[PDB]
Design a protein around this ligand. Structure first.
Ligand SMILES: CC(C)=CCC/C(C)=C/CN[C@@H](CCC(=O)O)C(=O)O
Ligand SMILES: [Mg+2]
Length: 429
């Protein structure tokens, strides 16, 4: 469409997330207003316990939205039929928007597979969130189901894992840790014992859809060990979260929170699959200690940004595992607004640490092939960082985001109206 008809729609109906075209104009506005002006501080306007949360998320990477977002959104009802879900829950997760904005330069299928991975994290997260309830409301049967589900989910990823190198089979086998006694190595594959296939988990169609795509698209020609490795790390992290949330003794320091969030942010799973979509790819990077730290900085930045945006909702859940609340518990002078400022500052320092690791990783490359591979893999993680910022910025319609921001809806509608008018006025120049 033209800026004139979009301006007419915004002046009359405002901005929506139900019309997928609006997101293209929102992301275009954010790039022109911020990135294109050298301003890498994106506004986040929300509330927490009645306190105004008015902060800036720092991210110096180029904003973009996938050209496939229109088709992804147009097929969202078919996609949702895979899930055991209400549409109310599916709409708030909005994996179509997450994948399109964090993975903007991929094919339709390579963008959709990222949506599937992020949706898997959200649905498992909301299943684990049952442990947030008071002790008198916990149902042990739901916890038994959850513990069985993630073990069965893990085996489904094991079932597509047939590495060319036996060293990669040992890498995953040694990484199973407390899950290893449930598995056996059988004909070059890691298999769950038949005793523990006791149910069909509620999101098994989703997990099978993920495994089928990875098996059919990447397993024949690429080394998918890191995809499996990150899934193991995530599933073990969910188990750690169950153990952490199960014991109502919440004793996580900020560093222990970082180490825990390194496992459960799920973006490393999406990066592992996205890495396989590019010819520039170095499997050795995954065991490079500097690259592993770069992935951890990325997960922590997303976590800290998420902690600010989820603060008011998680405060009502009495959920203590949020960097905003951990800092307040350690410092009594902090209210919610001042704590969010500290989290935002920590996120800025992690971003600078990310950029410092990036320069060191690329300088350590031994040849052009490895440099271009590392640079491509780092670029993929940068896409997710700016994508997640814009994801939270553009929560402008209630029901189509985990954390609707009515102050962002008002701010973006006021600002995009002036920007679209400037496009119309100088047209066709
Ligand atoms: C690009 C994406 C999608 C990154 C993952 C975002 C993230 C860090 C999710 C963690 N989930 C939160 C609560 C989110 C919610 O409930 O909406 C938690 O459990 O700490
Ligand atoms: Mg949280």
């Amino acid at each position: 469409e033209s800026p004139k008809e979009v301006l007419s729609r915004v002046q009359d109906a405002g901005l929506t997330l139900t019309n997928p075209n609006d997101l293209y104009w929102m992301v275009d506005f954010l790039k022109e207003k911020y990135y294109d002006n050298g301003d890498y501080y994106y506004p986040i306007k929300t509330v927490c316990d009645g306190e105004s949360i008015d902060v800036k998320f720092y991210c110096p990477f180029e904003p973009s939205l996938s050209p496939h977002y229109l088709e992804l959104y147009g097929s969202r009802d078919e996609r949702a039929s895979i899930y055991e879900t209400t549409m109310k829950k599916y709409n708030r997760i909005n994996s179509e928007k997450t994948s399109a904005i964090c993975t903007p330069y991929s094919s339709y299928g390579d963008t959709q597979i990222v949506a599937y991975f992020y949706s898997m994290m959200y649905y498992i997260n909301d299943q684990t969130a049952h442990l947030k309830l008071p002790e008198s409301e916990i149902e042990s049967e739901l916890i038994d189901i959850l513990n069985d589900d993630i073990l069965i989910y893990l085996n489904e990823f094991m079932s597509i894992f047939e590495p060319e190198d036996a060293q990669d089979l040992e890498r995953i086998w040694d990484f199973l840790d407390f899950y290893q006694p449930y598995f056996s190595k059988v004909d070059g594959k890691i298999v769950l014992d038949e005793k523990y296939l006791v149910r069909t988990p509620s999101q098994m169609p989703l997990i099978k859809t993920i495994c089928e795509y990875v098996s059919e698209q990447f397993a024949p020609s690429k080394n998918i060990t890191q995809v499996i490795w990150e899934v193991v790390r995530y599933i073990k992290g969910v188990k750690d979260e169950i153990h952490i949330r199960g014991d109502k003794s919440f004793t996580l320091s900020l560093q222990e929170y970082d180490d825990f969030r390194d496992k459960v942010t799920a973006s490393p799973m999406a990066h592992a699959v996205s890495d396989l979509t590019h010819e520039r790819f170095s499997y050795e990077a995954y065991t490079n200690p500097a690259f592993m730290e770069l992935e951890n900085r990325c997960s922590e930045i997303i976590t800290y940004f998420n902690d600010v945006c989820t603060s008011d909702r998680e405060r009502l859940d009495e959920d203590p595992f949020n960097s905003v609340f951990i800092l307040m518990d350690l410092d009594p002078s902090l209210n919610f607004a001042k704590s969010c400022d500290v989290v935002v500052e920590h996120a800025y320092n992690k971003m600078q640490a990310f950029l410092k690791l990036k320069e060191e990783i690329l300088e350590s490359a031994s040849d052009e092939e490895e440099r271009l591979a590392l640079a491509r893999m780092i670029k993929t993680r940068e896409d997710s960082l700016i994508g997640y910022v814009l994801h939270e910025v553009c929560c402008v319609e209630d029901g189509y985001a985990r954390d609707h921001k009515p102050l962002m809806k008002a701010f973006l509608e006021e600002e995009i109206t002036k920007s679209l008018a400037e496009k119309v006025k100088f047209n066709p120049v």
